[PDB]
């Protein structure tokens, strides 16, 4: 038996914000320096068991940064549990670029009068040294609309399981206390 | 609140198989007679109450039938809890292709570990004056496969509900009675 709680969690972002990484990070707990393009999309599945012996499976959708240019993209997002607007906390195009994905967010979630939860997630924080987004301006664009708030790092780890598992709670409703 | 019982249902195979039609039947019970050929894939949601207020949801991926050129199709099966394989009762050609789409089945079975549960689907019943493949033929490859066994008709809406409700009972092991 099982009870087949399964999330759609939906990976959105510019081609430099490491949407592939942060997902096999937690998915798989690995990382690849040398950048290999997403095409279209890839998917993931990982169980996690949150407070009170609660287990869920995530269904990750890794979306690949060029999607954006079409119309398949509206598809990728309809009925999303969940989703990560994720950029590269030392590339401005990265942030500026979420307006993009975020507006096609809004779209889907007006048309199919959903509200799957959206979270800002800074990624590359072991990069902070060359950091050009201030986390000011990330706490902003949260505020303005929402969003949780998460910064990571998929080639450290660092908070990447806690990303995953506070959004998977945020979702259902529980507690991590 | 909710169990977010979601079940991942992928439909497989040709063209003239009648996939997105079957799909739509189900999903918003509408059909159309002019071919719009799916690109990629498209995907529906439809929540639907077994025995026993047991409600679960059917994420219903509606591949593309050119897919089966190409690798994504081996990302779109995996994390199946059901795969429908469709075919057209009139067209020969279209049940001969069944062994392609189900080679690459098995195959993310075999990698993935796991053990989707595959229907046998034929579709546009309607037809069945003008019917090519013979019901025994169905029958053996059902028996070969261990499929269970579907006829159906997109167009009349015959069958269509009671196949996709069959397919989730069968998946989660309710009895149906
Ligand atoms: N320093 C650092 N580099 C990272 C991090 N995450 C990803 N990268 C690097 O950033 C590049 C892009 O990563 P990738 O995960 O492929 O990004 P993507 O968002 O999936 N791109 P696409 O949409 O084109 O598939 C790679 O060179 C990868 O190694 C991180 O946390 N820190
Ligand atoms: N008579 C009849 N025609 C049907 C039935 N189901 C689909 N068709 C017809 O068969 C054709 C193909 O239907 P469609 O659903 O688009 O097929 P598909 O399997 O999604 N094709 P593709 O993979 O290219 O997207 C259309 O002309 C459609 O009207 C059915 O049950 N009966
Ligand atoms: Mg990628
Ligand atoms: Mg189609």
Chains 1, 2 share one sequence.
Not at 33 to 62: A, C, E, H, M, S
Request: glycine share 10%; hydrophobic share 35%.
């Amino acid at each position: 038996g099982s009870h087949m709680r399964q999330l759609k969690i939906v990976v959105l972002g510019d081609g430099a914000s490491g949407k592939t990484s942060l997902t096999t990070c937690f998915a798989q707990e690995t990382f690849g320096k040398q950048y290999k393009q997403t095409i279209g999309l890839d998917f993931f599945l990982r169980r996690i068991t949150l407070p009170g012996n609660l287990n869920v499976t995530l269904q990750i959708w890794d979306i690949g940064g060029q999607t954006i240019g079409g119309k398949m993209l509206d598809k990728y997002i309809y009925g999303a549990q969940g989703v990560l607007l994720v950029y590269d906390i030392t590339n401005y195009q990265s942030f500026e670029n979420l307006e993009d994905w975020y507006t096609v967010v809004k779209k889907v979630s007006e048309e199919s009068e959903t509200q799957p939860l959206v979270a800002l997630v800074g990624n590359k924080i072991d990069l902070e040294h060359m950091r050009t987004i201030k986390p000011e301006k990330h706490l902003r664009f949260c505020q303005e609309n929402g969003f949780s708030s998460h910064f990571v790092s998929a080639k450290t780890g660092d908070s990447v399981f806690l990303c995953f598992q506070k959004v998977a709670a945020e979702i259902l409703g529980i507690k991590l206390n």
